[PDB]
Structures are given as structure tokens and as C-alpha cells.
């Protein structure tokens, strides 16, 4: 019963750091999953940068 | 041209580069920097009738104590009218962030109509910039909202809380026959003692009286009708400790003498319950001011910087990085680019 407390409590833990990995992440995979090579918006937007 | 756009906002509202408006306005983004010398102004348009936060402290007190009989003021009695307080400025706030607001939308305006030729261009580019900025008012006001309820939380006494009246010059004007004349000194009149000195550096401490268990009041005409006069008297001992016949005291006007005797009444004097719970009133009136002078000082300071990590940051951010992708989505880009038959 110990054993399985234990397990347990740690739980919170590792849920707010995968939790904040994906928020540091999320701003730039939002834009990487919608490339497509034939894009003359994407050159354009990276160009003016 | 978005470029043009980007670059304009950005001098128009930080007022950086050269080209600027030396003579026509005070204008340009730069009017929010009065807002932030006018919300100062809002923070003190409010007012209350100090005889309601009497009454109300009273009853706050009453209200402590159920049935127990009171020997030392409650900290609830001060904490209580303190949360009180704090909740009139929910208001202020609302509406300096409410006409900071209306400053963006009007100088994207002018960054967008007036240097715009193409049609339809000129609307997309100020409806989506518009559009952005409303959705930051709703974090913006959220985050003012959990600033305000932290005041609230807790009462801080440890920075610069008053950590445990009235002056002017008077003259004496029956002295005692072994000097005669009259004598003229700085008085100096506090909620707890009476103090004496020769000049305004109230270095002397000549003379020292208490305040309570005095009595005053007015002069039969026996005298040259030239100045106005009160007596100071005491019917418990038969001398004001060092007495001046009962220490007559003469002003220029009748309305310093009754800014006198106020301040008397200010400090626990009656007029020619009462002993205790009166002393608790005032007690608690000061420290009340003394932490709200604190509480608008830290709002004052914070207001602006929130609206800047909140609001405006995050539009700059917006123009630079993300204004051309969201003109990419909108109708169908056949229309857009379109010339207007001028």
C-alpha cells in the first residue's frame, strides 16, 4: 500500500512538466504541421521576415 | 505596404525615428502617457462623508465584540473597513483600460486609412488589428481583476504603515503681573498633548499640557474688542498646570478660533461610549488613511506596466509576426489588391 502511494503522489509532477513542454513547443508545431513545399505564402512570410 | 504599416505603428506609438510632429500635437500614442498622469486624477475624483465612516466604524466595532466586553480594539474592526475601501477601485481601473483602448483603435486609424490607397486592403488591415486588440482587453481586464482581490488577501503592516494635528502661532494675552504684556509662541496641538515652544523649530519644549479633561469656552467683553478669544480651562484642578488666568488665548478671527476648537474635538476634546470607544474611532480613522495612501500608490505603479506586458506588447508582437499570415486567409485573394478607380 506504501509502494502504491507513492507511485501515485508523483504523479502531479510529471503532469505539469510535459504540460509545459507542450506549451513551449505548441507556438512553433502549429506552424511546421501546415507546411506543404508548394506554398508561395510561406516563402513570401519567411522572405519578409 | 505592410511592411509601411508595421513600421509606422511601431514609430507612431513608442516615438522612436526622426520626422516627428515638433509643432502640430501633443499627440501620437503619446496621449497615453496622460492617461497614466490621469488616472491619478480618477483615483481621487471619489470622495466619501468622513461621518458615514464614523457610524460605519462604530458598528463594525459592535459587531466584533457579540456579547464580550471590549478592552483592546479588534484587528478585524481596521481590516474590515480596509476591504471595504478597496473595493471603490474596481471602477477607475476599468475605465483607464477602457480608454487606453480607444487610443490604439484611433491611431491604427490613422496609420491605416490616411496612407492607403487600395481598397478592401485598408479593411482588412484594421479589422484584424481591431479584432486582435479587443481579445486582449479581455486578458487585460482578468488580470487587473486578480491584482485587485490580492489587495484584498492580506493586510501588510511591515513597510511604511504608521509604525507604533494642528500648529500655528499664539499669543498670550494676560501675563502675570510680576511680567505683563503678552507673550507670543508656536503652538503645537496633537491628538494626545499640548506642547509650547519659542519658535518654529520646536526645539524649546517649554511647556507641556495634556488634552484630555480640559474644557473650553468663550470670554465675557471685559477686554479692548480688537482680537477674537477662547479660555482653556480646567474644572477637575484649580490650575491648567502652569495657568495663565486660565490661559486666555486670542486669534485673529473667529473662524481660527473654531478651527481650533475643531481640531480640539479632533484630537478627544468634547464640546463645553464617549471615553472609550471614541479613542478606538480615531485610532482606527488614522491607520485607515495611512494604508490607503499605500494601497493607491502600489495601483497607480502597477496599472500602467500591466497594460503594457498585456496590451500593447503583445499587439506590437502581432503587426510584426503574424498580420501578413491572417491577410493571406481572408476572402479569397482575387478581390484583395484591387485598385480603386482614383
Given at each position: 500500500q506504501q509502494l502504491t502511494n507513492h507511485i501515485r503522489d508523483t504523479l502531479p509532477g510529471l503532469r505539469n512538466k510535459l504540460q509545459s513542454q507542450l506549451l513551449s513547443i505548441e507556438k512553433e508545431v502549429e506552424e511546421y504541421k501546415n507546411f506543404?513545399?508548394?506554398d508561395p505564402a510561406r516563402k513570401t512570410k519567411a522572405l519578409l521576415q | 505596404m505592410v511592411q509601411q504599416f508595421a513600421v509606422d505603428f511601431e514609430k507612431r506609438i513608442?516615438?522612436?525615428?526622426?520626422?516627428?510632429?515638433?509643432?502640430?500635437?501633443?499627440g501620437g500614442a503619446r496621449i497615453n502617457r496622460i492617461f497614466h498622469e490621469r488616472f491619478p486624477f480618477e483615483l481621487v475624483k471619489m470622495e466619501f462623508d468622513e461621518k458615514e465612516l464614523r457610524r460605519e466604524i462604530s458598528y463594525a466595532i459592535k459587531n466584533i465584540h457579540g456579547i464580550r466586553t471590549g478592552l483592546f480594539t479588534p484587528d478585524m474592526a481596521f481590516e474590515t473597513i480596509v476591504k471595504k475601501q478597496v473595493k471603490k477601485i474596481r471602477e477607475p481601473c476599468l475605465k483607464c483600460v477602457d480608454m487606453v483602448i480607444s487610443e490604439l483603435i484611433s491611431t491604427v486609424r490613422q496609420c491605416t486609412k490616411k496612407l492607403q490607397q487600395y481598397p478592401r486592403l485598408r479593411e482588412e488591415m484594421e479589422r484584424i488589428v481591431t479584432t486582435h486588440i479587443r481579445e486582449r482587453e479581455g486578458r487585460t481586464k482578468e488580470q487587473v481583476m486578480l491584482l485587485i482581490d490580492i489587495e484584498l488577501a492580506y493586510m501588510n503592516?511591515?513597510?511604511?504603515?504608521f509604525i507604533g494635528i494642528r500648529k500655528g502661532w499664539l499669543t498670550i494675552n494676560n501675563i502675570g503681573i510680576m511680567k505683563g504684556g503678552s507673550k507670543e509662541y508656536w503652538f503645537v496641538l496633537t491628538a494626545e498633548n499640548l506642547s509650547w515652544y519659542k519658535?518654529?523649530?520646536?526645539?524649546?519644549?517649554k511647556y507641556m499640557l495634556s488634552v484630555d479633561n480640559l474644557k473650553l469656552r468663550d470670554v465675557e467683553?471685559?477686554?479692548?474688542?480688537?482680537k477674537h478669544i477662547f479660555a482653556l480651562f480646567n474644572?477637575?484642578?484649580?490650575?491648567?498646570?502652569?495657568?495663565?488666568?486660565?490661559?486666555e488665548l486670542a486669534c485673529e478671527t473667529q473662524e481660527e478660533v473654531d478651527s481650533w476648537k475643531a481640531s480640539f474635538l479632533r484630537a478627544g476634546v468634547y464640546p463645553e461610549m464617549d471615553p472609550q470607544l471614541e479613542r478606538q474611532v480615531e485610532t482606527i480613522r488614522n491607520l485607515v488613511d495611512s494604508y490607503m495612501a499605500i494601497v493607491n500608490k502600489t495601483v497607480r505603479d502597477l496599472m500602467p506596466k500591466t497594460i503594457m506586458h498585456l496590451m500593447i506588447n503583445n499587439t506590437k508582437e502581432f503587426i510584426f509576426s503574424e498580420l501578413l499570415a491572417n491577410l493571406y486567409s481572408?476572402?479569397?485573394?482575387?478581390?484583395?489588391m484591387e485598385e480603386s478607380a482614383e
Open positions: 506543404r513545399p508548394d | 513608442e516615438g522612436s525615428g526622426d520626422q516627428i510632429d515638433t509643432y502640430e500635437l501633443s503592516t511591515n513597510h511604511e504603515d519658535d518654529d523649530e520646536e526645539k524649546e519644549k467683553k471685559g477686554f479692548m474688542s480688537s474644572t477637575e484642578q484649580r490650575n491648567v498646570y502652569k495657568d495663565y488666568r486660565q490661559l481572408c476572402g479569397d485573394q482575387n478581390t484583395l
